[PDB]
């Protein structure tokens, strides 16, 4: 149908891509204790629960 | 340079040195630089012939 004049600028990015293999480098770690329990998520060398 | 363009994912197989230092950066400068320091005398060797 005949519509009022329509100017559109568009701007988009060149998403250049690598794609996304399944990770590898993962380490299960499982424990037992009377704190904390459950997944952990200790990603980073430094923080620790205490 | 070449390592932080591969690690964006242009493909450089093609491109000349020259332009591959013509490429964009964005807000990054990578540079290096060759020097050497002087010192003053510290130890002095002299050998005579009679």
């Known amino acids: 149908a005949i519509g009022l004049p329509s100017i559109n600028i568009s701007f988009k990015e060149l998403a250049t891509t690598v794609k996304e293999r399944s990770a590898r480098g993962i380490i299960a770690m499982v424990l037992k204790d009377a704190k904390a329990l459950g997944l952990n998520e200790i990603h980073e060398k430094e923080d620790i629960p205490v | ?50």
């Not at chain 2, 363009?5 to 950066?25: C, F, H, P, R």
């Open chain 2, 1 to 50: 340079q070449k390592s932080y363009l591969k690690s964006k994912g242009v493909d450089l197989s093609y491109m000349t040195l020259q332009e591959i230092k013509e490429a964009n950066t964005g807000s990054k400068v990578f540079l290096k630089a060759k020097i050497k320091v002087l010192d003053a005398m510290e130890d002095i060797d002299l050998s005579i012939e009679i």
